[PDB]
From a paper:
Three capsid types have been recognized from the nuclei of herpesvirus-infected cells: empty A-capsids, scaffolding-containing B-capsids, and DNA-filled C-capsids. A unique portal vertex exists at a 12th I5 vertex through which the genome is translocated during assembly. Here, portal proteins assemble into a dodecameric basket-like structure that is thought to seed the assembly of scaffolding proteins, in turn driving the formation of spherical procapsids composed of MCP, SCP, and triplexes. A separate protein complex, the terminase, associates with the dodecameric portal and initiates genome packaging and the concurrent autoproteolytic cleavage of the scaffold.
The resultant atomic structures reveal not only the expected A-, B-, and C-capsids but also capsids with portal vertices similar to C-capsids but no resolvable genome in the capsid lumen, which we named D-capsids. In addition to features consistent with previous herpesvirus structures, our data set reveals a previously unidentified capsid end product. These new capsids feature C-capsid-like “elevated” portals and, in many cases, terminal genome within the portal translocation channel, but no organized genome in the capsid lumen. We refer to these capsids as “D-capsids” because their C-capsid-like portal suggests they were originally C-capsids, but the absence of most of the genome indicates that they are degraded. In D-capsids, terminal DNA density exists in multiple conformations including one reminiscent of that in C-capsids, suggesting D-capsids are products of failed DNA retention. However, our D-capsid portal structures have the same portal basket position as C-capsids despite being mostly devoid of genome. These observations together suggest that genome pressure alone does not determine portal basket height, and the elevated portal position observed in C- and D-capsids may instead be an irreversible step during capsid maturation. D-capsid portals had 4 Å variability in height, but otherwise resembled C-capsid portals. The C12 reconstruction of both A- and B-capsid portal baskets revealed a small hook-like density with large aromatic side chains and sharp turns wedged into a hydrophobic pocket between the crown domains of each portal monomer. This density is weaker in A-capsids, but still conspicuous, whereas it is completely absent in C-capsids, D-capsids, and mature virions.
Residue numbers in the entry:
A (entry chain a), B (entry chain c): 24 to 27, 29 to 308, 494 to 623
The structure:
Amino acid sequence: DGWVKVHPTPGTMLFREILHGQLGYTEGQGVYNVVRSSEATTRQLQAAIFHALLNATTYRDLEADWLGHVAARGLQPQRLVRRYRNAREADIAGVAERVFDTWRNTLRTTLLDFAHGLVACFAPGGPSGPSSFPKYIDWLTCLGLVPILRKRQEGGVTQGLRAFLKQHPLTRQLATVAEAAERAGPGFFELALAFDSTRVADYDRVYIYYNHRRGDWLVRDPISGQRGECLVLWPPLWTGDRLVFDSPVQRLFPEIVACHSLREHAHVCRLRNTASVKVLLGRKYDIIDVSKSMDDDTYVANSFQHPYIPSYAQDLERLSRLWEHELVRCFKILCHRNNQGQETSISYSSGAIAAFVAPYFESVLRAPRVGAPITGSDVILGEEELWDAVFKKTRLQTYLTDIAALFVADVQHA
Amino acid sequence: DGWVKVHPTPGTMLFREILHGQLGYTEGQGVYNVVRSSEATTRQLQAAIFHALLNATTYRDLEADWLGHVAARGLQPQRLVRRYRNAREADIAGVAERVFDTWRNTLRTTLLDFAHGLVACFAPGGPSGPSSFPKYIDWLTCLGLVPILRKRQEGGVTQGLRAFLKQHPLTRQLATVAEAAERAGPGFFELALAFDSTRVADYDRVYIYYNHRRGDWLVRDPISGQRGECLVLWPPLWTGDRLVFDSPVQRLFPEIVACHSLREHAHVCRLRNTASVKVLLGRKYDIIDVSKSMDDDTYVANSFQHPYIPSYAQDLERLSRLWEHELVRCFKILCHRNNQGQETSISYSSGAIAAFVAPYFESVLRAPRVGAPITGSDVILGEEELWDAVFKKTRLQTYLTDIAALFVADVQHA
């Protein structure tokens, strides 16, 4: 009652073959390889993990750790003042500031190592393999639908997390690290659980059914028999005895088909003109035309020759430029420019990362909220630069600076 | 009695098929992918929510929170002066200013977290699904009409608000934030109800009737039988025989049709010239012309040959430029360029955001209020920078600065 098959039809297979370059290729299509890059998602995961780790810090625990470090070094301010026996406030303040700076550097590098360990643990799951981001992107590019199958199970990411966390020696060395780990454990476990729950269906196996009257989707895997959900980003259109998607490939399809047909005709015409001389016959390296079978009681009037050969450079150039412009504007890809002449730099714009990465996490993966998203510049930015940027901009720095200021004031005033 | 159907006619279906690119495609048409972007509406929602949250802050609650924080830290100004025992008012003023600054940073991060939570709650349902902004835009671009259907119901947005607001622990932490939230709750509920009540009809199901004698519109859904309202932004014209709309696609239609027909004729002529030699016959790889099928008391006088092949590159280029100029001048889209490079970025102008987003919220969504609209520059800005700007220019900055100045004066005069 109103159901119809959508995906296993030859049209989408032809779309995917076009995406693989099975018919024709152009320089401008190469931009698509940057669209599938998994840099933005990994950067977002790094930012989320950094925020989650640094949001568990406690001021009192940090103060206790600093006091313990000072006691271990035996560098209490009064002892140093009574050893130096001078009223040089600037010198003793500089000494205390240097000690605090060394402690800050050691804490920063320990936190960086722990955070990088967490990021490395989370890395293999998302960008490739199960629930891979390029699979989502080419799902969007071909159809506009992203079928998903869900089942509540454990996975390897959680196993790696539980193996790594329990044996980590950094917890036994710093109370702050252990407290942050134990407070953020449930969140990380839930995040990995969400990672391992979802699975984007492969292109060659899944089935999609659409009903026009009710306007609902059905997606199932014919092998396992499992039913899932069908996510739609831009909806298709029903024109009666047809279905027309609004994916970029759908828009670019007629031009590609026309250019391919032109190239085939050009090749066929080229192979015809191999011979140099051609001779015609009639009723009273070389190719002969015999018209005896058709000249029966017939008289020849005239004979014309015109060796036409089509040209297809302009069509290929236009198709390449069209592909580049369509992929740049549709996915909102930002290109950096040199001073003059050529330009070579491709990255994701802020609008692109928002409108594509955020729906991925929110709906496709159903992960919990990850906080404020990164900007478009942070994708270009490196790992350590992002780490110490978020370290500076977080509230962990304020407690450390306040402690340093109070300690320096107490040292210099006494 | 004067009613005539409008929308299910083949003309509008052909207009939509033109938008999907059935009748060819050009690089100029790709600018349409920026007109349908949902950045402006999300920016407006963020600004409205930020204003609603910031306007509800209370001076007395903030003063009480400041006193409580001072008591918790034990930072009584007189006690600190009696402890330090020095006449350096600059040092104590700097200490108080630093404490106020750290509290400012913590309050800012908590407010940002709560505001981002609300924005994430409102985001999924606004620009897509019900009241889909791209659907509104392509309704405007095809016809000039935006049919709507309304019903008073709750929805997922209200449920998400109910779950998030009452289960967020931030309310139990700061009295000021909870007080502002409980003041702003009714407005957020009304906004969510406005989101959930309005639905924009799909292009493939709804029906539209017009009657020129009275000048009235009728819109109905043939499936559910529900009757809605028909909104008009630029009115159409009635010429007796037909109804002529004034949407951009209507103006650009004849040029598109002419170019498509020219391309078809060029292809047909191209397929004819695949034969190198052509032969003619008459009464006393190869193509034979037997004109003796008609020869009866006849005599051949002369023969001619002229293999014409039309060219269509200039037409395609002109059509692309016309498409780009029409879209830019109609939707008022601002284009940015480098020193010599073209299309550094594409963004909505202030006139565009006003004249398109504001009528959307005011009529289609029937939102109660959106506050002062943002400029075109705020679209480029990210969420965090926009939040910083609105926080700087809001009412709350008055109370915070006044309290900080008064406390600094009291500390330095203690």
